[PDB]
Design a protein around this ligand. Structure first.
Ligand SMILES: [Cl-]
Ligand SMILES: [Mg+2]
Length: 192
């Protein structure tokens, strides 16, 4: 019943995306980033992260990295699935992304899963080792949902990231635009 309910959730969000994120215009596109960044900020506020990096990658992928605990990977009694899988298959960003990847650094291990329109492409995999903790999320907004534009606006991201760092003092939040490899722009904010 758990994973059927997952599938129905994805269908619901993709059918009425604007009920979930406000709009499917440029505003809703940028709201994807806010949803993810907000979750990292909660992890900082909980006491466990202090650095968040947002990268606009080639072809308008977004990568958000935090140095928090890493999303848990333990098997849920609820779903019979790893915790990270439950969390990401119930994410609006994931449902509304053509593709999304997560890398978790936790338990001295790097774990990876990928998704399309919220559907996992393979089971969560151990792919390496690590001496850090945190989470990396990379996603590509689905152009079938965001029919006006899937191109992010650096200045829009910059303005809100600046505001978020100012509001959440102590968190280092970095924005980087790598879309043009010949001219990479970065702004990093860190208030007291
Ligand atoms: Cl875990
Ligand atoms: Mg939260």
């Amino acid at each position: 019943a758990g994973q059927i309910q997952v599938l129905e959730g994805l269908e619901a969000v993709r059918k009425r995306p604007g009920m979930y994120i406000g709009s499917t215009s440029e505003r809703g596109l940028h709201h994807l980033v806010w949803e993810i960044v907000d979750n990292s900020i909660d992890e900082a506020l909980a006491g466990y992260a202090n650095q968040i990096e947002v990268v606009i990658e080639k072809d308008n992928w977004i990568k958000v990295t935090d140095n928090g605990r890493g999303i848990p990977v333990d098997i849920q009694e609820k779903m019979g699935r790893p915790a990270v899988e439950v969390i990401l298959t119930s994410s609006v960003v994931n449902a509304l992304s053509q593709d999304l990847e997560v890398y978790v650094h936790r338990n001295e291990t790097i774990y990876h899963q990928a998704y399309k329109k919220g559907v996992p492409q393979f089971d969560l995999k151990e792919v390496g080792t690590t001496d850090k903790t945190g989470t990396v999320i990379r996603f590509k907004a689905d152009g079938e949902i965001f029919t006006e534009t899937t191109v992010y606006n650096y200045e829009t991201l910059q303005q809100r990231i600046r505001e978020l760092a100012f509001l959440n003092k102590g968190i280092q939040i970095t924005l980087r635009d790598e879309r043009d490899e010949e001219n990479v722009r970065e702004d990093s904010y860190h208030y007291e």
